[PDB]
Design a protein around this ligand. Structure first.
Ligand code: MG
Ligand code: MG
Ligand code: MG
Ligand code: MG
Ligand code: MG
Ligand code: MG
Ligand code: MG
Ligand code: MG
Ligand code: MG
Ligand code: MG
Ligand code: MG
Ligand code: MG
Ligand code: MG
Ligand code: MG
Ligand code: MG
Ligand code: MG
Ligand code: MG
Ligand code: MG
Ligand code: MG
Ligand code: MG
Ligand code: MG
Ligand code: MG
Ligand code: MG
Ligand code: MG
Ligand code: MG
Ligand code: MG
Ligand code: MG
Ligand code: MG
Ligand code: MG
Ligand code: MG
Ligand code: MG
Ligand code: MG
Ligand code: MG
Ligand code: MG
Ligand code: MG
Ligand code: MG
Ligand code: MG
Ligand code: MG
Ligand code: MG
Ligand code: MG
Ligand code: MG
Ligand code: MG
Ligand code: MG
Ligand code: MG
Ligand code: MG
Ligand code: MG
Ligand code: MG
Ligand code: MG
Ligand code: MG
Ligand code: MG
Ligand code: MG
Ligand code: MG
Ligand code: MG
Ligand code: MG
Ligand code: MG
Ligand code: MG
Ligand code: MG
Lengths: 75, 64, 50, 96
RNA sequence: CUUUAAUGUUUGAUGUUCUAACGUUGACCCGUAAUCCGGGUUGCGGACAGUGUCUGGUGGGUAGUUUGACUGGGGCGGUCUCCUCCUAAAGAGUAACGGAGGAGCACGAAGGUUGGCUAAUCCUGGUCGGACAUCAGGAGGUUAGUGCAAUGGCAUAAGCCAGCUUGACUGCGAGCGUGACGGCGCGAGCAGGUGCGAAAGCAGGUCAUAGUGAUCCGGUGGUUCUGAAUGGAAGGGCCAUC
RNA sequence: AAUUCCUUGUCGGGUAAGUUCCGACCUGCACGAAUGGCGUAAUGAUGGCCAGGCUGUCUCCACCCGAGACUCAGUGAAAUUGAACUCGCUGUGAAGAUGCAGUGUACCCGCGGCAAGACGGAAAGACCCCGUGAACCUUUACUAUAGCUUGACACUGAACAU
RNA sequence: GUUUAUUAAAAACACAGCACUGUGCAAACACGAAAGUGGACGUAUACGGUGUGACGCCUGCCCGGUGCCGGAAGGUUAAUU
RNA sequence: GUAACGGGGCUAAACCAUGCACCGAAGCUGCGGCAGCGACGCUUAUGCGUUGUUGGGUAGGGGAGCGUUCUGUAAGCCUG
RNA sequence: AGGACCGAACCGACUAAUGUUGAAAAAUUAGCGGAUGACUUGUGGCUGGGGGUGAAAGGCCAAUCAAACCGGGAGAUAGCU
RNA sequence: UUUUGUAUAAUGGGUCAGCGACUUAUAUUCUGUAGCAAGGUUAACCGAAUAGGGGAGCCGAAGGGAAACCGAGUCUUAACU
RNA sequence: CCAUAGGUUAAUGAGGCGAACCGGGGGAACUGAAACAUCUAAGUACCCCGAGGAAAAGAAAUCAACCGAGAUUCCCCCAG
């Protein structure tokens, strides 16, 4: 009664801090907004964060909830 | 004697200019209505055979 | 499952149709929606629900 | 093509297209070939005499491959734009 | 030309009768000093029977074969695809007949957009009122809610309400991701046309992650691409869908 | 019970002692009426049990007569066999050692005997599994099919009546 | 009486008897693409098949299933047209 | 069959600490030698006074060779 | 009279021992069964391989049988050793 | 030899000698090497026969497109940043 | 009754053997498809009839494509 499992989704961070990404580059695969989208980051339908601009991945904590945000700083 | 082309492969692939092979995509024959428009559109153009499979195709298509 | 496949048919005489699904036991009326027809290239009323 | 019993690629993928019987009786001609005929004229039939095109080719087309350095008359053939200009730039007389 | 009686008359069924086909493993004659054969005469049946071609049924009488894999041996049982958590050793991935639960959908609104709202639970008091309906305040602060498992998310709400609507658009797609491959997924932006909104803008389906099936063979509609002399057509291709 | 799992069922007989046997009981796991049921004289190289007689079957062997075995002469095989200067023990180790380790014992070579070991010889295990092996066999497995059967047409015609 | 020649002789096979069923003769049935041949130079007190298996007392209920026999208004139904 | 230090035997030849010496391998070094892969000055179809490093190996891949019979070279060369 | 009785030839083969590179690819020794019958035996003949024949054991069909032997397809195929 | 692993009490071999297993043909591709080179090369056949002739053909110098068709561009789309 | 079957004789010819090739009449399965039935193997093997030095085939009721070719057979291409 206990022999089933789902194929693993390969979620998580694909581009880490300071990593130079081109526009379109997926940054995080996630279930929900564990990370939220910041400057030049789009949040897709599956809530994956992707880059809208070429530049450098920047993780940051912001706001009154101390939520985790990702932005691209143009180098 | 002459190698016999695998006739079924001759009907699914065509040799490109730099020796590659173009093929029609799978999953667009039927059951089209549950599939997103976007998925169907990317399946409409011919893709190229990947590296792992060019050996199989070339083996099957010697006179290509 | 229960829900059945239908074709939404363009009133522009093009022959273009969309495809979708409908529950027939509930909402037994004809699904009429404005949709883009790519032969005349305008939004157009589509009509059918089987 | 046997992949261990997995549905192999040649059958996993769909068939496409048809074969046109016209393509087999249709040949491209390079500008380099227009000098290989005897007499300056380039008809479908004098191209066969020069072994440029097959004996069963009914339709012939001159394309912009190579160069023509000669006044050449092309008759009953088709000519690309780029090819039409290279012929005309050398004393060319294309005749439909 | 509407209608409607008849027969030479065409073929339909049934019934009766016939004989000339056909049969005869009845008698008799000859070939022939032959229980075969044939012919002959005769009787008996007789358009039957019987055989051929076609056809439905029956048909282990006979034939060719199939009758799965995983598996702390095999078999019985259970399992086989997909989703969630744990195992999983703080990137991903990671096995067992390891531990635990779900899916094989639903929705023309439960989708898009504009505008608006914010729970559970307990406390106090109050008509029928119970320990719990509805009302008011208070404390509470999401301990709720999410069309359905679990996880991660969710107040700028993704949760509740209403108005207008069809972006559940078509063609494309920088670039990424994930896969041995097949493939799957994310995607700004462009063109065209639309909806919402005063506007910025948002909208290429639904909070997301399951809700599925390659190719072949066909079917349907579209498309004068092809069309075996030629014009067509058939069929094929291409597009959409089954 | 040629059928009974439980089961050496219960009781009784027979024996000093009887899982068998006989008889009866019924609680027939799971008899039963021509795939016969119940009996049944006779018959049986049939199965089971009892007794008399008999005996080396046995207690428990002993002796004897002969054919071999042993010795001489003559003839003269065989299976097997990687090579062998081929010991015990304890341990180790593809996990049960003549061959490794340690130790102990042992002068070299025969002959007659015995069979504990050489996982001895013999047969590419016959059980068990596997192979998308095989063969026969079964059937309301699949697909066919001889045969049987149905009808249409042909061989096959004439009339009469409705 | 028979049997596994060469590990089984038996409770197995057979058996007389019994029954069921088929068979009207160019018999059923069987060997045979066929002709023919057996059955049988027999003819239902016969022949073939099946089962039981001397003899004795007997052989009970069940025809829903499967077959077999029969019946036939209706429905379904092939080639053909 | 001692058979629970491998044995002999050991009261250290045991154990703990504190040290200095030795033994100990196909490891390292030393001498001589072969080969592979590089990189180097003269100079060159390069090979070296040179230099550096490598060189266990199944499946398996790569490279270079030995020998055998026959054909040509060969009516030649060796050989009673 | 008798598929009657005892018992030799004859036909068979229940037990035991021997032998198991045997004297023998199934026998020998002692015993055992049938022994006027459904007996046994000689000569010749017929039946042929999915076929025969079978008082039925899948028994036998030239020391070979759940499909004989010989030749051929044929170097079947062998994801195995 | 086979294996995770064999002195293994796992397999094979009594010994010697002799024989005994990646071939051949045709296609195709890659490498090396040679020839010619935007051209290369001929097949059958003829025969002045390993010559020479034979260029029928094959490959290559252009691709894109399902195809018509277009062509250094083409396809896609009404049209492409 | 005619006749016909049937009878006797004469003359002519055949009969059987043989390697392959040839034409015709019948016709497998293993195998391959990684199972198997369509399909494959293959009109192969095999059986049978008949012929000849070769046999068969053969002088368009053929192709072609609006230009034309001009019986059959065999070879190389077309083309896997
Ligand atoms: Mg389609
Ligand atoms: Mg030519
Ligand atoms: Mg069968
Ligand atoms: Mg078969
Ligand atoms: Mg299995
Ligand atoms: Mg992880
Ligand atoms: Mg980790
Ligand atoms: Mg737009
Ligand atoms: Mg959801
Ligand atoms: Mg069409
Ligand atoms: Mg036509
Ligand atoms: Mg036409
Ligand atoms: Mg006693
Ligand atoms: Mg006793
Ligand atoms: Mg019974
Ligand atoms: Mg008795
Ligand atoms: Mg002697
Ligand atoms: Mg010997
Ligand atoms: Mg020792
Ligand atoms: Mg001795
Ligand atoms: Mg042994
Ligand atoms: Mg074995
Ligand atoms: Mg056999
Ligand atoms: Mg008897
Ligand atoms: Mg026996
Ligand atoms: Mg016996
Ligand atoms: Mg009986
Ligand atoms: Mg009885
Ligand atoms: Mg009936
Ligand atoms: Mg002791
Ligand atoms: Mg010390
Ligand atoms: Mg040393
Ligand atoms: Mg060293
Ligand atoms: Mg040195
Ligand atoms: Mg080495
Ligand atoms: Mg080393
Ligand atoms: Mg007697
Ligand atoms: Mg007697
Ligand atoms: Mg005698
Ligand atoms: Mg004797
Ligand atoms: Mg005797
Ligand atoms: Mg007697
Ligand atoms: Mg049996
Ligand atoms: Mg025999
Ligand atoms: Mg032969
Ligand atoms: Mg073989
Ligand atoms: Mg063969
Ligand atoms: Mg092993
Ligand atoms: Mg092992
Ligand atoms: Mg070892
Ligand atoms: Mg040994
Ligand atoms: Mg062994
Ligand atoms: Mg050994
Ligand atoms: Mg051996
Ligand atoms: Mg077959
Ligand atoms: Mg097969
Ligand atoms: Mg076939």
């Amino acid at each position: 009664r206990n022999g089933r499992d789902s194929e693993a989704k390969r979620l998580g961070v694909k581009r880490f801090g300071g990593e130079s990404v081109l526009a379109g580059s997926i940054i995080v695969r996630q279930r929900g907004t564990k990370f939220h989208a910041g400057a030049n980051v789009g949040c897709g339908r599956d809530h994956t964060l992707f880059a809208k601009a070429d530049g450098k991945v920047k993780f940051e904590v912001k706001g009154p909830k101390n939520r985790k945000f990702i932005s691209i700083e143009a180098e | 004697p002459k190698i016999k082309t695998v006739r079924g492969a001759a009907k699914r692939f065509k040799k490109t200019g730099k020796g590659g092979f173009k093929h029609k995509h799978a999953n667009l024959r039927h059951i089209l209505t549950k599939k997103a428009t976007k998925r169907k559109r990317h399946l409409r153009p011919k893709a190229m055979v990947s590296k792992g499979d060019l050996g199989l195709v070339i083996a099957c298509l010697p006179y290509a | 499952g229960i829900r059945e496949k239908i074709k939404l048919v363009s009133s522009a005489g093009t022959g273009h149709f969309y495809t979708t699904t409908k529950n027939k036991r509930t909402k037994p009326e004809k699904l009429e929606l404005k949709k883009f027809d790519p032969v005349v290239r305008q939004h157009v009323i589509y009509k059918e629900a089987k | 093509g046997f992949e261990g019993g997995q549905m192999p690629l040649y059958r996993r993928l769909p068939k496409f297209g048809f074969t046109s019987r016209k393509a087999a009786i249709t040949a491209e001609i390079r500008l380099s070939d227009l000098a290989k005929v005897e007499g300056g004229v380039v008809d479908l039939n004098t191209l066969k005499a020069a072994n440029i095109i097959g004996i069963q080719i009914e339709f012939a087309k001159v394309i912009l491959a190579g160069e023509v350095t000669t006044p050449v008359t092309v008759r009953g053939l088709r000519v690309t734009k780029g090819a039409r200009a290279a012929i005309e730039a050398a004393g060319g007389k294309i005749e439909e």
